[PDB]
Amino acid sequence: PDGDRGPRGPPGYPGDDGPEGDPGPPGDPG
Amino acid sequence: PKGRPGPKGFPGYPGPRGRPGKKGPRGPPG
Amino acid sequence: SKGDPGPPGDRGPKGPPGYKGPPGDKGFR
């Protein structure tokens, strides 16, 4: 019979910086 | 007789999420 | 008889993109 399945691989590396935030509100009228 | 080597391990966990996205652009003048 | 252990798995996938960033600053008066 086959031997045991091998160990799981290590954790993945970090993801990209996320999507840019929305433009801010306009200055007060005013 | 000795069996075959076991199967390859499963992939590791997905990596950590990336940093929050950059703050958005400054809004327009009032 | 039982075979030897299999090889290690691959490193996991690259993580997901970060969450959307915060709103930009209020504009100039």
Which residue from A minimizes the CA distance to B19?
Answer: A17
Burial group, residue A29, by CB count within 10 angstroms (0-12, 13-18, 19+): exposed
Alpha carbons within 13 A on the beta-carbon side of B15:
16
Contact (Cβ atoms closer than 8 angstroms) between residue A15 and residue B20? no
CA C1 – CA B26 distance, rounded (Å): 69
Neighbours of chain C (3+ CB pairs under 8 A): A, B
Report the distance separating Cα B6 and Cα B14, nearest Å: 24
Resolution in A: 1.5
Interchain pair A21, C20: CB under 8 A: yes
| Residues 6 or more apart whose Cβ sits within 8 Å of residue B26 | A23, A24, C24, C25, C26, C27, C28
Interacting residues of B28 by C-beta distance below 8 A, sequence separation 6+: A23, A26, A27, C27
Q: What DSSP assignment string belongs to B5-29? A: PPPPPPP-PPPPPPPPPPPPPP---
Reading the block at residue C16, the tokens are 């997901």
